[PDB]
Amino acid sequence: PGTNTSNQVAVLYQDVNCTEVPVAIVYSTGSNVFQTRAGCLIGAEHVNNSYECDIPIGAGICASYQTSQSIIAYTMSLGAENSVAYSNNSIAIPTNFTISVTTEILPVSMTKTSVDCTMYICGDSTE
Amino acid sequence: LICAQKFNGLTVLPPLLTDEMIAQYTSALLAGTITSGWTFGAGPALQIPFPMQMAYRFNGIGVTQNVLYENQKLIANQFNSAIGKIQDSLSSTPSALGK
Amino acid sequence: PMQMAYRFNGIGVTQNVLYENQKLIANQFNSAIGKIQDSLSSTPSALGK
Amino acid sequence: TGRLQSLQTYVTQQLIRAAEIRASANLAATKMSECVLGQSKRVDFCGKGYHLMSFPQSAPHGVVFLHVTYVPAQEKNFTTAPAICHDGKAHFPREGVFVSNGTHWFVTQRNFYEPQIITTDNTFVSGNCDVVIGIVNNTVYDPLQPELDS
Amino acid sequence: TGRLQSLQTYVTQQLIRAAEIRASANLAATKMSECVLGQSKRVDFCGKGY
Ligand SMILES: *[C@@H]1O[C@H](CO)[C@@H](O[C@@H]2O[C@H](CO)[C@@H](O)[C@H](O)[C@H]2NC(C)=O)[C@H](O)[C@H]1NC(C)=O
Ligand SMILES: *[C@@H]1O[C@H](CO)[C@@H](O)[C@H](O)[C@H]1NC(C)=O
Ligand SMILES: *[C@@H]1O[C@H](CO)[C@@H](O)[C@H](O)[C@H]1NC(C)=O
Ligand SMILES: *[C@@H]1O[C@H](CO)[C@@H](O)[C@H](O)[C@H]1NC(C)=O
Ligand SMILES: *[C@@H]1O[C@H](CO)[C@@H](O)[C@H](O)[C@H]1NC(C)=O
Ligand SMILES: *[C@@H]1O[C@H](CO)[C@@H](O)[C@H](O)[C@H]1NC(C)=O
Ligand SMILES: *[C@@H]1O[C@H](CO)[C@@H](O)[C@H](O)[C@H]1NC(C)=O
């Protein structure tokens, strides 16, 4: 996570069997070892709730930092569930509106750069 | 590609989204397109039936809606047969997914 | 005002709404501009692009 | 040889980045010409929701657009029926969808609740009343004949 | 030297292919946002015909 928030780091071994990480392995101790399709995650406990993704990992496992103070990994939450009562004799209509305003940012041009070939490749040598 | 490349440094990082979640997104998009209309793409959604959704969609090409209600049965049969035709043509095509 | 009165004709709401809610719409638009100003004023990283 | 290799590597990367910035600039040009100078009926192009207009702002090597969009907020229930029969002839709404609160029927536009009484000016007829499902018995006031006694 | 040259060749080709796939993805995104979530009066964009 951000160095401002904390300093606790966790390691991820890519596609290495957590059943074989004893061959692979202060963080080499078995404290909270989790297994993902992306590999073996060491240094973060596992949580069962659902949150939005903050730092992607792989196979949908998303990790975050929440408080005592440690790193967690969880199933990424597609969003809050919702359902709508379909029926063929009802209609739902708005009765009030809202004028919102949103910002879109587009790059246009980059820095007009030029390069001197001979100077950069040879300096000031006649040879 | 089986294992030789995986044993020469070449790794394949798995995609961020699994197939099931993508299927869930597509199911959500279909649910919104069926029970809501175009509203759910602009904030909160509205519930509104299906026949009186095409009844408004036909207003968007140049034919007034009374056509749909006067030909509901035929149009239903035609749409179902069209879906079946997609299913069978996809079922019996050797090379239709070159792209 | 009679430009918004025509622009609302371009989404599916007839213009009489705007002339009946002119004051509220004015207040809402001004508050929206203020909200842009403050959110831009107090954002650390919003210009990554 | 080594420095040369570095040169064409850098030049190639710069060329590619120029390609992406060209694509982005073209997209921005289309956005400017379709939002600011008019009103675009497309969605997810001139902001999220029904669009109204825009305003450009300059910035170091870029532009910033303030899309102004219209978004409905609160929602209300009503009972609907896609047709009305009055005197053995079907009726269809002109530019609304037939809604009601239970005892009186009304026609409204489809992005703001604004009911009105249904008369001939609001409906057009087509055929008789055994053609489609959803028919609801109702009455349509005539604003033309009953007014003139003489 | 030789294997390096192979590396830059492969990386350059992958970069280009990423460019085309990005263009195609943007086109698909516009198609999704203009067809599915509404009705597009354009022709030859949301299918052939009205
Ligand atoms: C449905 O809406 C109509 C339209 O306002 C209501 O009819 C009027 O209701 C008011 C107050 O309830 C009465 O003073 C009027 O006499 C009613 N009739 C007319 C012609 O204005 C009706 O009451 C509403 N029904 C429900 C169940 O809410
Ligand atoms: C990982 O270990 C499990 C132990 O049950 C084994 O079944 C599986 O084949 C292993 N996966 C490998 C070696 O890729
Ligand atoms: C999370 O779920 C697993 C699945 O069984 C369970 O073993 C574990 O105890 C749970 N952790 C909690 C509830 O903190
Ligand atoms: C659909 O409308 C028909 C009217 O013929 C009705 O019989 C049926 O119950 C309706 N479906 C519902 C309410 O789910
Ligand atoms: C519509 O929303 C505005 C915004 O605050 C509010 O002032 C007004 O009372 C609302 N009208 C309703 C809920 O009928
Ligand atoms: C609107 O009516 C539906 C039934 O058609 C109901 O499920 C829903 O809760 C209602 N909305 C309200 C009460 O806000
Ligand atoms: C509507 O009224 C007519 C009167 O002739 C009747 O024949 C018909 O059955 C009614 N339809 C209804 C109540 O749905």
From Swiss-Prot, chain E:
Q: List the disulfide bonds.
A: C35-C46
Recorded superkingdom: Viruses
Biological role = Subunit of the fusion protein that is processed upon entry into the host cell. Mediates fusion of the virion and cellular membranes by functioning as a class I viral fusion protein. Contains a viral fusion peptide that is unmasked after S2 cleavage. This cleavage can occur at the cell membrane by host TMPRSS2 or during endocytosis by host CSTL. In either case, this triggers an extensive and irreversible conformational change that leads to fusion of the viral envelope with the cellular cytoplasmic membrane, releasing viral genomic RNA into the host cell cytoplasm.
Q: What is this protein called?
A: Spike protein S2'
Gene name, Swiss-Prot/TrEMBL? S
Q: Which residues of the full protein are shown?
A: 998 to 1047 of 1273
